[PDB]
From Swiss-Prot, chains A, B:
Fe cation 1 binds at E71, E109, H112, E190. Its EC number is 1.14.19.26. This is Acyl-[acyl-carrier-protein] 6-desaturase. It is an enzyme of class 1 (oxidoreductase). GO terms for biological process: fatty acid biosynthetic process. Transmembrane segments: none annotated. The chain holds residues 61 to 386 of 387 of the full protein. Changing G168A: Catalytic activity converted to a delta(9)-18:0-ACP desaturase. Gain of a delta(9) desaturase activity with both 18:0-ACP and 16:0-ACP. Belongs to the fatty acid desaturase type 2 family. Delta(6) fatty acid desaturase introducing a cis double bond at carbon 6 of palmitoyl-[acyl-carrier protein](16:0-ACP), producing 16:1(6Z)-ACP. No activity with the coenzyme A ester of the fatty acid. The position of the double bond is determined by its distance from the carboxyl end of the fatty acid. Low activity with several saturated acyl-[acyl-carrier protein]s, including 14:0-ACP and 18:0-ACP. Requires reduced ferredoxin for detectable in vitro activity. Its cofactor is Fe(2+).
Amino acid sequence: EKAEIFNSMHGWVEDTILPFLKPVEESWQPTDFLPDSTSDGFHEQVEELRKRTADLPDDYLVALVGAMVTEEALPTYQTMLNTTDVIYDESGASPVPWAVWTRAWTAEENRHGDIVNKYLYLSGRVDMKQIEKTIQYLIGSGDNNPYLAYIYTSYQERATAISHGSLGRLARQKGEMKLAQICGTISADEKRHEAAYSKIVEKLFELDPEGTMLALAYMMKMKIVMPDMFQHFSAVSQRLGIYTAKEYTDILEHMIARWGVDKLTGLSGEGRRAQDYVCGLPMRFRKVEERAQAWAENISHVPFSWIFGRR
Amino acid sequence: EKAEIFNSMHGWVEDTILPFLKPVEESWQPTDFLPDSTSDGFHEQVEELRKRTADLPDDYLVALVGAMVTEEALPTYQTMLNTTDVIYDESGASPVPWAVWTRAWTAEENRHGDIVNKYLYLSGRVDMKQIEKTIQYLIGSGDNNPYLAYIYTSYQERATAISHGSLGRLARQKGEMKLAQICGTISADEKRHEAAYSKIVEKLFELDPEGTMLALAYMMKMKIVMPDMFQHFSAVSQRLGIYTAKEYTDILEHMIARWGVDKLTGLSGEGRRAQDYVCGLPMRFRKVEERAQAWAENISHVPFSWIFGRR
Ligand SMILES: [Fe+3]
Ligand SMILES: [Fe+3]
Ligand SMILES: [Fe+3]
Ligand SMILES: [Fe+3]
């Protein structure tokens, strides 16, 4: 039945989801936000960047490294959403619209880690050797239910749109307008992605409320949890205001509203147990917001000095 | 039966394939082969690179762009080999050794496109904006039989080990010792990868000669073919001697020998038709080697001037 639900969605994925892609022709590329290496001005542009970035506080460097590590892990996030599927009909073989979306979306995502990685490299502010190791360990690390991937990615796209957006805003506040542009441009990609993925989940709730509710309850319980090295990234994002416990709870309420999870009808006893669990979470998580803030305020970079580069 | 063949191989994959991984601790990283951005010497090192790279012929620039485009497409090559599999036993849940290999191998591969991409960027010799577009189109483009991926990757790892190795050798010949090191270091990764993948195919031939032969015949016929923009990369690799029609044929003979495809026994009529087809290919491809060379010698960069950066 899940396979068939997915199959029956092809037309709507084509009509409603694929338009959320931005044409490659109209798309920014990392080179847009970097010193021009073909230009006689290259060295001077690189120097300006390094000057601009010497003004950035340490917390900010760390959050930005957090964001790049997350993005650079792209090969291990698109893998769940990869569907070994291809449709046969009178026009011949073609790719399922699900795969057309995943592939093009992966191509979008690929630019996010590259821009931040080359920008941080050029700044000199972080030790790119240690961070590349981290990333190799992380790709090396990398339940089969096919709704789960879609739900998780909805949440992740909204969280990452908000985090990159807030990083951008703080870069702007410090006068680092190129870094603000980078962070803001990524955020705008993520806002589109979040829109496509939320709509997919919406549609799954429409067509299979029982399956989707059980999957969402599983995801909230098991996978998607309130927002040592990753703990440290998390603490820094908390105290900077980029991505907080309050924002996590706010994302949960938005998703509950957007998908009308507290308004589902016709559920079994099992479905209602799952709906009750999910819908009761925001009240549970409000209570731990003020503790998240205190904990973040005590974090030291001393165990993490290895992240930093030139001062 | 293919699923079961794969399942029955877990112990041997663990004992024989996983040791071909290089520990992340002992591993090079892109930063190793790049100007040190944390150093007061950064600008000077970047200048040395740009000087070293001004000595590189155009054919060489193009082949190197070919290689990076190929590598940077990594998200669309690991996807077939991704297996949504996880083993349950008395120790709990664990990852199938197939997935442990794929993940760690993907983490290895991720460094290949990054090093070449940042090196080419810093050189100024190519227009990275146009090449990033190309790459986005290419990831966006990106039969389900599970032997096919393993066979294809065997061939691809041997081809890419030979191509990066020969690019390295030519960089060396021009005195560009850092670029030679990069190309040579990648080649050595690919030689390990090729060894792991050839051994997998070997084992598939041992355990299921009939299935593997039919898959190999399919791959030679359909997918793996004698070595406009990709045609142009191919022509340049031909005339430079980096990767030629003769080398393609040589890879086919090596694989036939390594896996003893001309020595399989107990095949059905169908199996023997497939074995005869494959084993007759090298004689067929020798005949078109001298034509590949002539064709490559007539290629113009004029339609491809968009690749180039500063002169
Ligand atoms: Fe992203
Ligand atoms: Fe995204
Ligand atoms: Fe490679
Ligand atoms: Fe490889």
